[PDB]
Amino acid sequence: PKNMGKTIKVYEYVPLLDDRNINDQGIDANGAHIVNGNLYGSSKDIGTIT
């Protein structure tokens, strides 16, 4: 639309379990704050998700 700058931008909502959604809100299954907020952030591993 006119009178509305010269730029269009949208919002992309990323899934929880990917790697792109790194944040600081993380408490593991024991109760200790961890660096990664996403549980098994698309590791596709066995040991990591275990």
Partner: protein, 181 residues
Amino acid sequence: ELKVAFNKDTYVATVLDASGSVPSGSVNVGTFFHPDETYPDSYVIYHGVRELLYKRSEVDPAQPGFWPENITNMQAVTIDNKATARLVLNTSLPRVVSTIEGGKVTLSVVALGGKAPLKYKWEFRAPNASTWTAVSGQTTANLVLDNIDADKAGEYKVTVTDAAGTSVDSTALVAVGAYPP
């Protein structure tokens, strides 16, 4: 001044005394008066640990913190007390005793606190005065007044002091009818 420690792994809040040694793993989180200075018979040790972990941090229970990130889940912590039990008076002196001149009035106090040398004290206020006068000699619990005269009337106050600093007192007013000589 009860000193509290806290290990973040086992979630054990060891309430040590002022001269304790923090356990390997725990870290100093603060200090509080277990016999609260202002309201002495309203809060318990739990009511002092909660006020100490609210100002702490889940990330590391060593740095201070507040509401969004603090140790407020008061179900995982297990208070492990190693502080001497408060000096309490199990049996205090009677409010009033009243005999006649010549009778035998005995007063007894039982204390259950924490110390090896539980020393005692005794004072005496005449019923017109303002300052307490030291009762010389009697320094061991039961105080016996035999052949009590009229001049030995007023208010007696024991003072059970433990080893370091704690003291608890209790009074007992004594009356003696004096028949004419």
